[PDB]
Assembly symmetry: D2
Homo-oligomer: 254 residues x 4
């Protein structure tokens, strides 16, 4: 039960977004929500999606996490508008299509660093900026994937970025733990989203999970959301630095 709580949800682009899964769950549970977006087309979508939710207000903020200024200023506004918050759901990554296929060894410098910036470094600065609105502590949750732990065909430059995000989560837990701020990851199973369209072999991935993972089935966004609710609430009070897989057991098998 999340009444009185306020969460910032980062990275809804549309109805299939993992973060929109997160949103429905927290909304259903009683939370007040604030959404951040990058593209104009995403603000429009959010505008249309908020009619499903039970939020009396729409608290929408443009933040491109490639700019320090937009993060600093975006969180500063949030505080002025809604006050102190209880956590942040981070659902943000990017890579060029070029570097999500063929050969990892040909990734460009610029393409490599672009994925680190957006998909890993972004959590450090969000956490720093968010920390200023959690003086009594809170919870930060970032979205990860199996390709950060094992080399998987195609995910290429994103795997190295996911590996980097998961360590980020561990150094942030260590740093922020004395401020009563917990930092964890959800490692979601594969899911049909707009960003998945740039992961080569996606369909085959989806299928190899039905056939082989313990639950013999794929997970959806609402499942990411129910775990996110546990992480973002006091249910998970002893838990930090952790990486929960929501993937039907796939992580546990070979």
């Amino acid at each position: 039960n999340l009444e009185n709580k306020t969460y910032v949800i980062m990275g809804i682009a549309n109805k299939r977004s993992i973060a929109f899964g997160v949103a429905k769950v927290l909304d259903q549970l009683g939370a007040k929500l604030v959404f951040t977006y990058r593209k104009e087309r995403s603000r429009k979508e959010l505008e249309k999606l908020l009619e499903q939710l039970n939020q009396p207000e729409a608290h929408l903020y443009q933040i491109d996490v490639q700019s320090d200024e937009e993060v600093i200023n975006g969180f500063e506004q949030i505080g002025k508008d809604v006050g102190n918050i209880d956590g942040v759901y981070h659902s943000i990554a990017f890579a060029n299509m070029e570097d999500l296929r063929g050969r990892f060894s040909e990734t460009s410098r610029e393409g490599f660093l672009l994925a680190q910036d957006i998909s890993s470094y972004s959590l450090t600065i969000v956490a720093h900026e968010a920390k200023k609105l959690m003086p009594e502590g809170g919870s930060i949750v970032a979205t990860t994937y199996l390709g950060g732990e094992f080399a998987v065909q195609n995910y290429n430059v994103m795997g190295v970025a996911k590996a980097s995000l998961e360590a980020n989560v561990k150094y942030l837990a260590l740093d922020l733990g004395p401020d009563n701020i917990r930092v964890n990851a959800i490692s979601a199973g594969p899911i049909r989203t707009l960003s998945a369209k740039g992961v080569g072999g996606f369909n085959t991935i989806l299928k190899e999970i039905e056939e082989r993972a313990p639950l013999k089935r794929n997970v959806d966004q609402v499942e990411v959301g129910k775990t996110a609710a546990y992480l973002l609430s006091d249910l998970s009070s002893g838990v930090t630095g952790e990486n929960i897989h929501v993937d039907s057991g796939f992580h546990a098998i070979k």
Copy 2:
């Protein structure tokens, strides 16, 4: 909310048993509970404990996990008395105290096997027998410790048995996955319990955690129960074969 759910909690010895921390969390949440004990000492401890809970009736069954017949007959009686269950919290381990100090290279065959039998195998037989009471799926959660993943001075025979338990969970997850039964482990930070009096240098454990772990404080049994509630419920659908550390982040630092 766990109303009209039913869970079998295994291994409460006294007010301090981790498992009693599980029991309060689920009782609060509206679940019907059923308890199993090994020895009278606890039958009587349990009498008095359950007046602190809101269980309108006390369902208590004596099971020693060294006996197939008692594991088998116990669960059959549970079902005739209570119908189908939603899950099982397993909170049982044992070693001989000589094998919890000194040199691991000295462990006897009897002592080694005693710890595997009780602390590991028992989850297999329990899972086989509870499956019979979970025709529509359910959740099973065992209690493990960081000594299963790393060598820690003194824990010795228990560390190898805990590593064996944690694989036990992965192999049960894969097996029962297709029956909609999920199997996970909670990895609890150090807690002053009865069994914990048997481990060598347990005091220095507690303090090493306060000083060094990200949250810079110790966990308690209620913190286990809360996470156990997450695991035993629909919030963790899509999560199986997993091991959630509830240990102030200590698993994640070196």
Copy 3:
């Protein structure tokens, strides 16, 4: 890597395809003195004829069933008299009932479970405690494990919990015996066509998945495990203890 003046006990050759026979060809070729332990009379017969191919002056053959404290304590004691002090042990022993090696892991008997723990895991602890007696100036112990000790792999069932237990054992033995200058490590071998492999449901499927999916797109052999053993049993690995080296075409790094 030069192995003259060095003596290693190899535990678990049964025939020419044994993984331990790979270890043996490498060690011998590097000039170490070898001492062999077997359980079944048939294994020794097989060792006797395999020895012809090695460059060993004499057979050092000892019957040790690791299920017996006496056989372990007396064999090591008897080895350390025939040859004196030693340098390392290659451990290569495991067993599970075939019933417990296919179908449903939730159906495993207590008996078959403890059987697998006893033979395939406990034996490491007691062998090291006896082997230590013969390594006053230090040494090196290596056991043999499988990816199934680290993930739930189909069919492998009771043995994967046994390997899980093997792995922690190696780590705990490393912590225990480090001050004594004794290292303890594991090789995690990819699937190899052997006698014990016959008991593992789905084996041909396993090998084929490696060829199709592991980074080297091929299967490894006994000699390849052998080569890494030499590393681990010798002073190139000084510094390395409690390690688990995967010799598997890189299969462990992918999903």
Copy 4:
């Protein structure tokens, strides 16, 4: 071992305590031809004076700042022209601002973060791409990591995250280049008095924690690191790829 007729590229010697200098004396001793790459004019000077301690008939030195694609591309193309095909590459290169090292991790700057990724992680990818051109029948690439890549350690901050990245790079490089017969691995070294260690808060208490807690209850040296390098860079390690072999007294194995 036997590295006569092999040629390796060693990147990252700065002085006589460079970890890569460990690597070099072992390779040299094992009979390899060696080619060394450097960034700062001063390191080239130190190398020329370190080459005297080695059995190297010819000094092959190449200026390579891994921040520059054209510098890696041209240095490798040049190496190929002066020695022919090579057998492997020891990579031993990392960098981060003290500014970003001795802080609260959450206060790390963007440019600081990406500088560490660029130098310490991305450069393996490009080295590997250029080095492949000189390994038409295969080879071996080794990079140098640190336990701080697997858990959050005090003070390591920006570098542990770069190391986490380095450790994914190796796995992805391994999977991508396996078919070409190129193995790719890391050594996770324990701590060691080096020029670069001077950037790391609390280094003294880190050396002393290993001493009091790692199963060997002592610290390792460059030379130990080198001996595992030899194994990884040679055919001893043929089944092995995408591995992280820890040369740290067993510290990784404990809590």
